[PDB]
Each structure stands twice: as structure tokens, then as C-alpha cells.
Symmetry: D2
Subunit: 456 residues, 4 copies
Amino acid sequence: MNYPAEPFRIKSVETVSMIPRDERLKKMQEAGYNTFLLNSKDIYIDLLTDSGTNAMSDKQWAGMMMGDEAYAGSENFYHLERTVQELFGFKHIVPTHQGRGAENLLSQLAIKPGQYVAGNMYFTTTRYHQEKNGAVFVDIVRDEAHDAGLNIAFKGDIDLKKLQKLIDEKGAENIAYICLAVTVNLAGGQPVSMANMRAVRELTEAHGIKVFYDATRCVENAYFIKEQEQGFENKSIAEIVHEMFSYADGCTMSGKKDCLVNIGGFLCMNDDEMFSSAKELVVVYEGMPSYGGLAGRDMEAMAIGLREAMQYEYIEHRVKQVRYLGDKLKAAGVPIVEPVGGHAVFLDARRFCEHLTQDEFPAQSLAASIYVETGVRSMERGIISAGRNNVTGEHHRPKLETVRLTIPRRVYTYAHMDVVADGIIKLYQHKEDIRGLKFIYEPKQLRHFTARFDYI
Amino acid sequence: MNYPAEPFRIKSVETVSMIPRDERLKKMQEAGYNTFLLNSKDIYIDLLTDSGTNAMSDKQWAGMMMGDEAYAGSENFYHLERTVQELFGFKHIVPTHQGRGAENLLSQLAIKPGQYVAGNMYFTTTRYHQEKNGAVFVDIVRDEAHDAGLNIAFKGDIDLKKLQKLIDEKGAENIAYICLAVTVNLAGGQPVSMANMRAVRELTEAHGIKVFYDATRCVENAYFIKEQEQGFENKSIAEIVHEMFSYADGCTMSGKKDCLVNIGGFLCMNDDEMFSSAKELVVVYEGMPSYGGLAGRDMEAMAIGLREAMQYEYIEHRVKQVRYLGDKLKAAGVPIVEPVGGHAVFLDARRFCEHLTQDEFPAQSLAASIYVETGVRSMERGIISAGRNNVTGEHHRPKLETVRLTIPRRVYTYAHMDVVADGIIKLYQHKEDIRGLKFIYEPKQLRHFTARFDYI
Amino acid sequence: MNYPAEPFRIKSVETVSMIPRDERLKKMQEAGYNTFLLNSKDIYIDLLTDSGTNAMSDKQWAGMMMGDEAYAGSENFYHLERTVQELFGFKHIVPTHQGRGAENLLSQLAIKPGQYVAGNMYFTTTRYHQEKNGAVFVDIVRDEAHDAGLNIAFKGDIDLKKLQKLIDEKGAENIAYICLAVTVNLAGGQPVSMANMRAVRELTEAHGIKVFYDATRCVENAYFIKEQEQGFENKSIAEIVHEMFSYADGCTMSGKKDCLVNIGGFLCMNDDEMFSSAKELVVVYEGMPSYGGLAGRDMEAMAIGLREAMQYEYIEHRVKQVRYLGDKLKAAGVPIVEPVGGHAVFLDARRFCEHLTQDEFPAQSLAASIYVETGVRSMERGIISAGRNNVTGEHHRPKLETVRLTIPRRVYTYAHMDVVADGIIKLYQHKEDIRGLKFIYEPKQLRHFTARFDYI
Amino acid sequence: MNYPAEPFRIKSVETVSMIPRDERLKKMQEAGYNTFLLNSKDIYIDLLTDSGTNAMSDKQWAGMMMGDEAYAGSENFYHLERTVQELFGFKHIVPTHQGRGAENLLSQLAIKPGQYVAGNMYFTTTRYHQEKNGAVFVDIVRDEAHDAGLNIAFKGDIDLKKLQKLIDEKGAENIAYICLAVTVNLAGGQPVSMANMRAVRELTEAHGIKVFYDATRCVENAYFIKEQEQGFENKSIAEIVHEMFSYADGCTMSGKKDCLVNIGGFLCMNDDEMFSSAKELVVVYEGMPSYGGLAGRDMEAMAIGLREAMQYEYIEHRVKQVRYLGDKLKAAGVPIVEPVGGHAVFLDARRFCEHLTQDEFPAQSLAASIYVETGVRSMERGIISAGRNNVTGEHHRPKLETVRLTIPRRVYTYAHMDVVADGIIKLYQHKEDIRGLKFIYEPKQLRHFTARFDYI
Ligand SMILES: CC1=C(O)/C(=C\N=C(/Cc2ccc(O)c(F)c2)C(=O)O)C(COP(=O)(O)O)=CN1
Ligand SMILES: CC1=C(O)/C(=C\N=C(/Cc2ccc(O)c(F)c2)C(=O)O)C(COP(=O)(O)O)=CN1
Ligand SMILES: CC1=C(O)/C(=C\N=C(/Cc2ccc(O)c(F)c2)C(=O)O)C(COP(=O)(O)O)=CN1
Ligand SMILES: CC1=C(O)/C(=C\N=C(/Cc2ccc(O)c(F)c2)C(=O)O)C(COP(=O)(O)O)=CN1
Ligand SMILES: [K+]
Ligand SMILES: [K+]
Ligand SMILES: [K+]
Ligand SMILES: [K+]
């Protein structure tokens, strides 16, 4: 089916409600026109992020009651370890409270100052942690991933020619590692093909370069592989996931996405020495190698969640619900990044706000207008998030200037998607009304989280 | 709005799945062609009943962690007591584990053998408990309630002429009480108007006759009053509910319906003497006057749920979701009871299976076929449920021969409704294939729950 | 150990507090000097009963999150069914909301008016249900069970000579069944030996008489067999429990005791015909044969709890904690029923209040005084509970006139036991102050639950 | 009362068990004789730490069901924020996943390389983050805090003459801040007096020096003030806590101690500019200013638990339960740190193992032997934990060479304390059997967490 019914039913609910437009106007201004700064109770449908906002199952809530809260050697850590070893096939695991805790560890463990890290498109926390440890980030994603309107499969693939050029020009020894993300968040939640994963393994292995996956949305990625990559139509999601990670030396994971939890992450690796070093560092920032800044009950819920995520009907519906929202938006001519990704519809604010230049922050302003007009919260994924160039002080200027309608797993229905689409479509009819913004307060890094703006 | 989005979002889920038709064929025969005898894991979408199958809120689950499990005087009982006193306006409450526990008490308390009980249509457990205690049930519902296809408002209303006729012919002193149900389940979930409740109160009070409400779906009932009775458009659901019970001497309640819980009921009354007698009897069958066969945590969840149920947007959506299913079926030509009621769509098995006689049990067989062809469980509400005449031994033979597609509160989506409608519409295309049934095992009372059948 | 440390640790808590003496004085008066009528919030340590007041484990609370709330065929019911079949060895089980629900079913199913039911001492709800159905209760417990101060093992044993006498004088066909309770609650929590169950099975079998156990505290009973009956020292609690029920035709169970839950019970039987008849009747009073008036989650919690109860260290500590309280009392010369039973210490009010006659209700008044002086709630288990002779209207006058300090499973500590002991011992120093009571309001049955009194 | 009964009762339990000595011997060797490396399942009574191991209340578990899991502006964050503002009286709060996350933030925010941080005794993570950010740690605790056997009140107090000397010799501008911990963990859980907090506040404010409290066991600290400092006997615990922090510029807090939770922490400050900088940094390591690496439900549980901690009878019993264990050990002549502190009894391993030198790691070995002989886990708090001098590479070699029997809040009973005491006293009788240890694996920082040893 184009659009399957939910492969689950509702066990428990939380209410939603909408404050009137006059009040939303005030709230948007109080938040300095940054949706990050709005309060949860003032939001009707919260599409800021699919991170940590997921609905857990009855089985996970059973796990929540069985936390072994020991400071060291918790049974829940061992359940998590066994599960990740079985499903991902990595030798070793260090839990972290969430994904950027794992990025902090990886970056300190695997980067020498002066080295290059090459990735399939930047990510905000990921790039900050690479740069603060002395690395230069090099984008090796295929060109197509920066082309918003282009409807092509596997937009997240690395261009092997860009990888080869980095190697030839800078030398393999000067490359800390390749960061391969599945899916690619800022490209629109775009998947990477198994073919590309295998090809990257082969090239890097030949030159002795390590490859660490960002595994955060690896199950959405696995779904696209099953759906679209020839040869995989009859493989299980679990088989796909396991093969994906066989092409990697380790991974960072925010469990707050595809592990279907509200908190949690981990760092994996095959190398014994790196594992030892990781454990020496985890106690500095996170907690013991057997809790990593998580309560025992959360290691448990994460272990259970990862295994649930492998169910075909669950992930098919997950992805197709997002696709449904995108299809409704397209049917009305609303410009979006194509194809629709695993976790979100990305409005293309470059097209939506043609009357604004990127320097007046059209994505940031569009996200504010969406809230004011509909009570829906969405996220800036453009020039603000991209941050400043750490050598020149200028904005990084991504080609993609987008607003992310991000869907938490198992929280909303198609009726909620219809409400979102209807509201965005009405706003599009008067898109010329959206005004440019300027900074009135800009943090020194990861500025999108807490920046404040005013209208031009 | 015709069909509002859910005014809540999902906090936790439980998976659903479907076993193939060939296995369902076998399971249906193992169940003696009676949907009550099917196992839960063998059912894809379970519309057997809206009783006790509801999804609770996060707030209710918080109350589930706060059970004061004292054998007597639990703080949870006091919370329930004051909630019901506030919302229903009755003087006294006695908790029971569910509705038929309250029916057992009322019937033993209020019936002298040989007396009449008059109601707006029979109900199965209610009539059995009336008859077990020596009463003769008299149906005083308006004639239109028995006319499946007749689309009129407030089909649940008592015909005051029938009540008057009973008083005239039998004498007021020979009437134990009037049972006034809101809504009327077996009529299709049909509401009773405020005007009717008032007229019933006036006539009964003039003859000294007691009126006990069956409050089980009172909130659905209050919704229909708000929506359709002129003079009530601007009243809150809560003030409608309170006014309704101001015309009663007490009530039975299965909380497993409109109190949004999985177990729980109670008996209310204004009379001090009956309250005293009720407390003497509750300890025989249920438990103390302060737990009545419930865990403290369940009195808590029931108190919280009754109050949540008064939110307009919740109950508007609840009722319109049922209406949506009914609208799809009607549009495709599938025969249903009209108008659509508060809790369920009722297929008209008489019209659906015109090739069968009522003696061949078309509702029971239609329910079996629905399960075989779709994995949806539905309920017989026809000749089987109506039981036998306890004087003559003949089947009661109700005019309404129906299969009930019953919707748990806050559990399913419109997509689930679409799946259900598609399946029933497909079966309707070959309705001539539905075969008649005969009993192979018949229980001595309430026979629909566990009777077994074979095809004739 | 005489007194083992708890074989568990605390996963969660609820607070306790004590209102001052002058407030307790007022509350006791407002409660008509009946401890049943006190509110939970006004109680410091609530020892009214071990029924439904148990602390569940983390595993049970895990189970509480996994309720399959289906109206029929719940997976939780099948887990319960398979657990009871495995552990008790009965063919069939019918769930009930608690114990007296099962007694209602048994008594209606197995008693013809005019017949005798013989038991190892009466119990309150049990005897009422026997009588209501037209049986005469005959006490066949050994004489020693009525001798409060006698310290002998297996006081709950049936006297085979009394059973034989009944067979000889009334005929086997006039005995509905034998009701063998393990342990015997009103004898002081006294166990029955395996030797005795064997002998009763043999005598009843020879005469075609049925034996139904009251299984309510069968695990406490199994503990005494293991501790004290020759040949059982190396048998597991589970092995002992299974052998016990191999001597029975069925059982009633209140799960609210040894199944470690807050609500729940069941009826078991080996006979196919009785099982069919039980299922016809369960739907009248309780619910479906597959929920019996319980939420799915509670059948789950009860299935888990029954299996947990078989852990030797748990039930060892359970029983020895009670024994600890009894030993502290005996050390101070406070008169109690001997030996200490499985679930409670029974103060011997006959000796404690030797200045009052039984017609002045010493046990009722002692219970009132204990609350006033200490904030501890305890239960009348004497002339009040015994009720009225249904032929003569006089009080039944049990030899045992006792006040029960009943200990919920896994709730209190030895320090709590010490506080209770200190309070009772202090009261004992001035026991002469305890005043006689008289009825002010007397229910027609099970009078102890809600009766009100005043000082003579 | 010397030792009060628990001012709560048990709501739910988790089982404990003991593996036999021969298995414990093997597990201990497998853990390289480091108790941190043992598995929770292999531990009978786990006294490793009071961090994150607490039992929550029913009210907290209710709060666990009401997590608003929004990525930004969660209602649970606002509850935590207003709770801490009310109770601690700081202007601003930034949540962190636990204490060392708050220490990472404070140290990066408030230290310029080469500055001094002075504190009332070192702590492990605290000193590491100070040093890693370029500070030199200066111990300004009174000399008596380092004298295990010296029983004096308020041993945690800063020596004002050491602070004055630091200011005189280094200059106030070269002091990054003062770290004032309440209680002082490594001194034995020793309280700081209100008089000392005032004196430190006066001196630091005169030189424009900031004082940040380590708030981790501030409620235990408040208890000692109430119990022992003249002029506070009639004040509530909450009034005392609020006054304490009125002498501070901010705090770090691990909520995993006195906030009665299993995960959680925060950083407080009064200064607006520092709040802004902390928010710029929190997003790097932890998460948003409104979740800081915690699930919404954990911010809820922490807000609830901090408020519960202020209950006098709760904290009185908490501290007096520790005292009970300490009193038992002292009476048998087992050497301990005196007086007994808020959270633990510290065995004095220098005196316990007088036949060993500190170079042979007697605290580390004594902890290993306690586990082998008793199944009780305890913590090294001596030469291993103290780590190496970051200039010379020599062991810090603290005067206090101790093993900590650390008591989680609301988890164990006095009977568990008796079992622990019995086992320690028994081991003390053959204390000369305890063998010296040497490193076989030594981490580069915080080495006690994962170091492995072998017998000399
Ligand atoms: C592919 C990847 C992520 O998507 C990711 C997180 N994602 C978020 C949360 C967030 C992160 C960065 C932002 O600029 C942002 F505005 C929102 C999100 O909504 O997209 C992390 C970091 O994992 P943590 O969030 O568990 O630390 C690593 N890798
Ligand atoms: C208007 C009313 C009810 O609808 C009702 C129950 N209703 C059910 C459950 C059920 C009852 C009787 C059946 O023949 C049946 F097949 C199903 C239902 O599905 O409709 C009760 C009794 O409340 P209890 O179920 O809490 O005891 C009293 N009054
Ligand atoms: C050996 C047996 C029991 O002990 C028992 C109950 N016991 C209670 C509760 C109660 C019962 C009767 C009283 O007079 C009383 F004051 C208190 C108790 O505290 O002892 C039941 C009945 O099980 P239900 O309580 O689940 O219906 C059957 N059999
Ligand atoms: C006075 C203070 C603490 O006691 C403290 C922690 N205490 C622990 C856990 C632990 C910490 C350090 C160790 O060497 C250790 F072996 C155990 C403990 O058991 O004592 C923290 C840090 O708070 P976090 O643990 O929430 O990050 C800051 N300040
Ligand atoms: K249910
Ligand atoms: K209870
Ligand atoms: K923990
Ligand atoms: K979250």
C-alpha cells in the first residue's frame, strides 16, 4: 500500500491543544522568533524533532519497571550490549547519555589536531566536536545531495571521486576517519545504498583509513535499501542493518531516534585498543562503561526499542507516514526537498521564500511563521544551523535552506499529518508575507539552539 | 468539523498483527463459530467491545502509581466518591468491580418478586439480573428504536404512553423501578434527550416510582444532547451530565465504558436507607463499601478518567470517529442501524443476510464471516444475545438483528476505520455466501458469551 | 536463622505517619469503635489484613505494563491458566475478581439445599455463601484448633473421627463437599499437614465425597510442611504445593493473599462438567471465563506473583517476620494464639481482657484500644466476626476470641514489628482499662465489616 | 530516638541473592580484584555507592508517567526549575545528566589556566575537571578532616586561615573560585556548619572571589546543622537548606544523591552572564538548556524527589540508619572514620590492615576481601581514588585510606545493616589474612573505576 494503517494500536495517550493565533504571535516574539525557544505547552503539534520524542511500546514500559540501578555491572547494560552486538555486529559498546556524548568520545579518541574528517554532509554537533578537536571537515557527499528539488534515489551516497581526491591531495595518514551517516539528516533524511557502503569500505581499507558510521537513523536507511536497492527486496530489515555495519569500524548512535527511546546513545568499535581508551574517557564525561550517564531502566528500554525497530511493518509505516505528509504538500505545489526522507519532510525555504536572500534567514523566518499560523513547531535546517566558518568568521552557506517538519516515531496519525499539510498550504498562499530576520543574540557555537532574532 | 483529528497524541503503543485467512478459517471453527471464543492474539482489530478495552492517559497512569491499597478507607475511594458526587450529583456511591456487580446489587435491593421493571430497551446482564430476582421486564422505549433503518434523533427516548399504560394496567406499587439507560446500547448506542429525562422524572415522581439510570455511556449521551438538542448548544458536557442525573434517584455504572478504564463500576443512590442496605450487601459479593472489588489504583484511574471524559474535544472526536466508519459503510450501500450511535456501528444483519431467516442466526454468522475474511472481531447483537423467554422458553426474537463494530476509546485511528470499512464492503459484495448457523452448545443464560454453533 | 534479613531490597516506598492520640480518639469514636470503619490516612501501621495490601515486585510491575485488555481470550488469562495448571495441578481454572467471588460460584454450583458442608473451622464469607445456598456448616477441625493457648504443630488438621461421624449420621449423599482450608485463617494461620490431606482424600474418595481446598494461604502452609513435617525437609515449596492439591477436587483462591497481589482470585476444578457449569455462571457475576472481573494486567500480576511466592527464602522470611512479632509479645507475657501462624499474630483477647465477658465483645474493644493507644489498626476475629446462628438468632460463640495483627507481604520491616510490639506491650500493662462494647448498628450478615458500637 | 523505624513502608521490591564464597572468589579475581568491575547480579548487598541507587516514592513513579518528552521547553523542566529556585534560592538553573556534567560546565566556564581552585578536600571527578582545565587544586579543609579517628563536629569546615593564606600568597584575582562541598564525601560524609558558610561568604565577597557549592549531599548536611549547630534546632530542613545556599554564588549538584533519583544533575548560578555562557556550552555536551541530557520524566522525578528529601523524619532516619551500622562496627572495635557521616560508614583501612603499607593498597584489598567473605560490595576511597600528582606523576597518597560502606536512600533495612556489620566484624578477626595488591592495568585518569590489580 501507498499508505498502510498503523501496525500498532494506542495503549496510552497525552492530550494536545492549541493556543489562539494572538497568543502564538506573543509567544513567537518572546522566543526571539526562534522556534527552539518556544515552550512545549504552547505548541499544538510539535514537529521540532524526532529526537527523544518517540512513543515507547508496552514492552519497553515493562522494561522501564525492571531497572537494575547498580552503579556498575547493571543487568540492563548487559542486555543492551548483547542486543547491539547481535544486531549491529560490533565487537564492543560504550553507552553514552545520548549521541553527542558519543561524538565527544569519538572525536577525542580518533582525531589528531591538523587532520581531516570526511563525511557525507556535515552535521551540527558532529562538526563542532570534530573542529574543537582540531580537525578540518571535508564534505564528500555526492553533489546531488545538495540539490534540493532533485528526486533521485540514495542521495546520501559518498562520491568516491571526492574521497579519492582527499586521499591523493592530503594523504591517507592525514585523514582521521570517514564519517558515514545513515540516513543523512541535513540532506533531507536521505539514505545511503549498500553498494556505496561496500565501495567506501573497500577504498578506505586499501589505504588503512577508519570508517565510523553515524547510526542514528540506520533503520530508516535499512528500509530504503529493502524498498529500493535491487537484490534486497526479500532481505529482512535486521539482515540489512547487520550487513550495513559489517562495512564499518564502529559507530556513534543517538538511540533517541531509531532505538525508539526518550534518552540514550552509545559508541561502538571493533578495535580492542580504542575500546580500552574509550572506557578511560567515558568516566570523565558520562559515567561507567556499564551505564554511560543513563539510568539502568533506560539501557533496558533502549535494548528493547532497537529490537522492535527491526520489524518491517513498523518501519514501513514509519517512513510512509512521512511520505504521506510530503505527498500532500507536493499535491498543492509546496516546494520540498525530494525525495521525502526517513524522518521528516523538509520545506525548501529557498523556494518558499523566493523574495528573501539567504542572509535574511528565510528558513528561520518560515519556521516562525508556520508556528504563528498553525501552532505547529518545526526546525531551521539552513544557514543558521550551518554556523560560522572557523577560519574566516563568515556564515557557512549551505545550498540547502530548509525547514524541517520532523515526525516522532509512533506519536501522530495521518489525521495529524493532514492538519499539518493544510496549515502549511494555507501559509504558502501568502508566502510573500514572510519577513526577513537578523540576529540580536548569537551564541559562539551551535548557534541555532538559542539564538534570538528580530525582523529586518 | 465533520471529522476532527485526534485531540491527543500517542504516549505508548501495543503492536497488532494479522494471521492469514486459512488460519482464521480454522480458528473460527475451533471457536464454534462464536467470535467471543476467539483468542486475542488471533485478532487483528478487536471491535468485540468498547468495554474495558480503552486506552488510558498519562494522567491516569500516574494515578495507577498512587494506589492506596488499604482494605478499608483507601484515599483512592474518597477521590472517586467526591468526583462522582461532583460530576453526577448523587448523594452516595458504592463501588463495584464492574457494571453487572452493580446490577446484582440494585436488583437484589430494589425488586420484590412479581414486580415489573420497565426500561428503554432490554440489556443482557441487566435483564438477567432483573429476572433472577423475580421481576418481569417491560420495554417502554419508543417504537422507533426497534426500526434499524429509520433515521431519527434521540431514538433512546422512553415512550411516556407506554409507561402510563404500565402504571394504569399494573399499578404503580407493582413497578419496582424504571431503568433509564444513556445511551441505549442495543438500539445502536442511541441517545436520550434531556426533555425525555425530565418528562420521565415528572411522571414517575407523581406516582412515587423510582428511576435508576444506567450511566454506562452517559458522556456519549451528553455529547448528542450538546450537538442536537436545541437549548444545549452552549452548555458544557459536564453541566449536561450533571443535569441528566438530577432527574434520577440513582444509577448503575460500568466505568469500563465512559470512565475510560479497563475495570471498574459503581452504584449510586440518593436514598440513605438504600445506601445502608447496599453497604450490607456489597461485602457479600464485591468487597468493602470503600473498594467494592477494586484495587485502590483502579478507583483512582476511574476517578481521573470520568473527569477526563468531560472534555468536549475528546468526546466530540470519540463520537465522530464512530460516525466516520458509519458514513463510509452507508455510502457503499452496507445496511446499518441509523443514525450512527455513540460507541459502535451496528450492521443490520437482517438486510445484510436477507437470504437467511432470523432463526438461522444471521448476526452470529455474519460476525464469524467478518472475522474469517478480515481478521476484525465484531459482536452478535441479535437473537442470540436476546436469550429465551423465561416463562415460555421461546427465543425473545428482537426486531434488531445486528452485528456490532464496537470502538474502544482512544485506541484506533481513522486508518483502522478505513481498513475495517474496506473489509465489510468487500464481504457485502458476496453476502450470499454467508451460511446459517445452529446451536451445538447453548448455556442456560447469557448464552451469547459461550454458545457454540455449526453451519446448517 | 531465627530471623533472616529480608531476601529483597526496596524498589519503591510510600510514606507513613501518625496522627496524635487525641485525634485518634475522635476518629475511633466517629468509626463507631469499629477499626474497619477507620480511614487509611488516619492509620500509622495498617495491620487490618494481609489481603490485597501486599507489595508487588519489579517483575510484577513489568507485568502490569503488559495488560492485554481484550474482553475475551486475553493473553494474560492464558499465562494465568498455564501457571495455575503447572503449579497447582488442577485441570481447569475460572478467574474471579477475588476470593468471595469464587465462593459465590462454588456454593451455587455444588450445594443442594438441606445438604451439609464440612470444614476445618468456619470462615466468614465462606460460611455465609454456604448458608445462603441452603447448606448447614459442620466444623470438623481437630479440637486443638479451638484451644488458643496450646502450642502444637498442624492445628488446622481435620479430625477424621468427626468427618466419619458426619458420614455415619447424615449419609455421604447429604454432604455437598468438604472445605479444607490451607492455612486455617481463624485458628490463627494454622497449617494442615500433608498426612492429613492424604487421609481426608482417602476417606472422602471412598464415600464419593468431593473436597475443595481454600487455597488462599497455601504457600504459607507449604512452608510449615517443609519446616516441620518429617520427609519434607528437602522438598521444594513448589513440590509441596503441587502434592497438596493432588489431594483436592478443586479450590477457591483469593490471590490477594499468597499470590502477592492487590486484587484477584480464581476457582479451580478437575471435573469437566463442573467447569462447564462454572463458565455458565461466571458471566452473571464476574465477567468472561477469560477475565472473571479482572483487568488483563491483574491476571498477569497474579500469574507472576504466584510463581514468586514459591521462592523458599521469600516465604521463609515472610513467616519468620510474623513469628518475630509473636516472640517479642510472648517474651513480655502478652497472651497470643500459639504457635504463631503464617500471616498474623492473634492476640488472645479472652486472656488480654479477662475482666470482660465474651458478650461484651473483648476482641472488638481491644482492637479499638490498640488503635487509640498506638495508631496501629488490627482486626476483630471473635464473637463479632462469627455472626448469628441462622436458626436460633443467638451469637455463634467461638472459643477463639482474638485480635489479629495481620502482616501484609513485603511491606513492613522488623523495626515496624518492634514498634507494634512496644505499643501492644505498653497497652497490656493497663489492660484493665479496656471497656466492654455493645451493638449500636448490626448488619444482617457479615456484621463485623460495618457494625457500629458504643461503650457499655 | 537512637534509631527510628523507617518513616515509610515498602511499595515494591526487587529480590536479592547471594552466590556462594567459592564463586565470589572467582568473580573477584575475574574483576582484577577491583569491586567496581563486579557484576550487579553477583552482589548480595551493594554498598558501592549511594549514587543513583536510591528507591523512589510512589509520587515520583507517578511523575515518571508524566514525562513531557519535548526536545525544548518541556513542562518537566519548568517544574524542576521552580523547585530548585524555591528550595535553593538560586536565580538560574541548567540541567545536566549528572554531577560531573555540571562539573565539566563549571570548570570550562570559571577557570582560566594557571588559576587556583580551593576546596574543602578534593573530590575525584571534581579535581580532574579542575586540573584538565588548567587549575591547581588547593585543599583548604581544616586539618582535622584528614584525621580519621578524631571525633569532632563539622569536620567539613574550611580553615579560614588557609583561605586567607591562599589569597595573601597568590592574589584574589588568581583564585578561580572556592569549591565548598556539603557534606564532604571523602572526609567521611562530614558536615559543614552554617557558621563556616557565613565566614567563607564574608571573606570571599570582600576579595570579589566566587564560591560555588557542591550541593550533592546538602540535605544530609542540613540534617547535621539542625541536629548539632546551636541556633538551628527549631528550623525546618528546608529553611536550613535555603539559608546554606544564600552564602553561595551557585552550585553543582548530582541529583543521584540527595534528590532521591537514579539519574540527573544540574548547575545553578546567580550571575546572568554566567547563565548565558553556561547555556552556550550545555548544548555541546549535554543537551538543551531545558533538558540537559535528561528525559522529561527524569527532570520530573528529580523535582519531586528534592522536595521529598526536605522531610525531617525521612532525612533523620536516613542519617541514623548509617549511624546504626557505624555504631555496631565501633562497638566491636572495628576501626572507622569518626564521627559517622551522612551517607556511609568509612572503614579505616590503614588501621584495619596495619600489617600492609599504603603502597600495597590496603583499602583496595580490604574491599575485595569484604566481597569474597560477605557478598557485600564496598568502595576504595584511598590511595587509588586519589590518583596521581599531575606534575610529578607520584601517587597523591592521602592520609585517609578508607573503604566506604555506602548506603543508598530508602533501599535497605536495619536487618541488612546487621548482616553487613556481622560480616565486617567477622573479617576483622582475621584481618592479617588480607594480602597486598599491585597494579596490572592503570587508566590515565580516574583510575579507581576500571584499574585491575593482582596480589603481591
Ligand atoms: C544524524 C545525527 C543526528 O540527527 C543527531 C541529533 N539529531 C537531532 C537532535 C539535535 C541535534 C543537533 C541539532 O542541531 C539539532 F537542532 C537537534 C535532530 O533533531 O536532528 C546527533 C546528535 O545526537 P543527540 O541529539 O542524541 O546528541 C548525531 N547525529
Ligand atoms: C448499557 C450497559 C452495558 O453496555 C454493559 C456492558 N456492556 C458490554 C460488555 C458486555 C456485557 C453484556 C453483554 O451481553 C456483552 F456481550 C458484553 C458491551 O460490550 O456492550 C453493562 C454491564 O457492565 P459490565 O460489563 O461492566 O458488567 C451494563 N449496562
Ligand atoms: C481463608 C480465606 C480468607 O482469609 C479470605 C479473606 N480474608 C480476608 C479478607 C476478609 C474476608 C473476610 C473477613 O471476615 C474479613 F474481615 C476480611 C482477611 O483479612 O482474612 C477469603 C475471601 O477472599 P476475598 O477477601 O478475596 O473475597 C476466603 N478464604
Ligand atoms: C561530592 C560529589 C560526589 O560525591 C559525586 C559523585 N559521587 C559518587 C559517584 C562517583 C563519582 C566519583 C567517584 O570517584 C566514584 F567512585 C563514584 C559516589 O559514589 O560518591 C560527584 C559527581 O556526580 P556524578 O557521579 O553524578 O557525576 C560530585 N560531587
Ligand atoms: K479489560
Ligand atoms: K487492595
Ligand atoms: K542508576
Ligand atoms: K526526551
